Amino acid sequence: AAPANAVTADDPTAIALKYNQDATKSERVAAARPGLPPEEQHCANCQFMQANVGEGDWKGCQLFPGKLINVNGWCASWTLKAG
Numbered sequence: 001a002a003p004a005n006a007v008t009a010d011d012p013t014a015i016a017l018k019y020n021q022d023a024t025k026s027e028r029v030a031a032a033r034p035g036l037p038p039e040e041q042h043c044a045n046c047q048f049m050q051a052n053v054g055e056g057d058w059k060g061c062q063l064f065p066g067k068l069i070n071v072n073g074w075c076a077s078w079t080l081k082a083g
């Protein structure tokens with residue numbers, strides 16, 4: 001079950017970025033964002049995931065202030081975690 005502050009499918013920014021809590025139900029292949037092949041991309045390996053926010057599988061994303069994403073999710077702002 002998601003947390004009360006989870007990013008949801010109805011959030012305008014989530015819609016614009018094509019976020020899904022489950023990267024296997026995402027359009028990562030169509031987007032072909034650079035840095036890894038698309039099937040390898042999800043929030044856990046994204047530069048914007050905040051590992052010190054949230055708990056368990058539900059972590060922060062810098063782009064979604066006050067909310068939580070799932071580490072197994074994806075959106076079109078996916079960017080390789082480089083530091």
Ligand code: SF4
Pocket residue numbers: 019042043044046047048049050060061062063069073074075076077078079
């Ligand atoms: S920016 Fe990165 S961490 Fe945030 S929802 Fe998109 S893929 Fe996940």
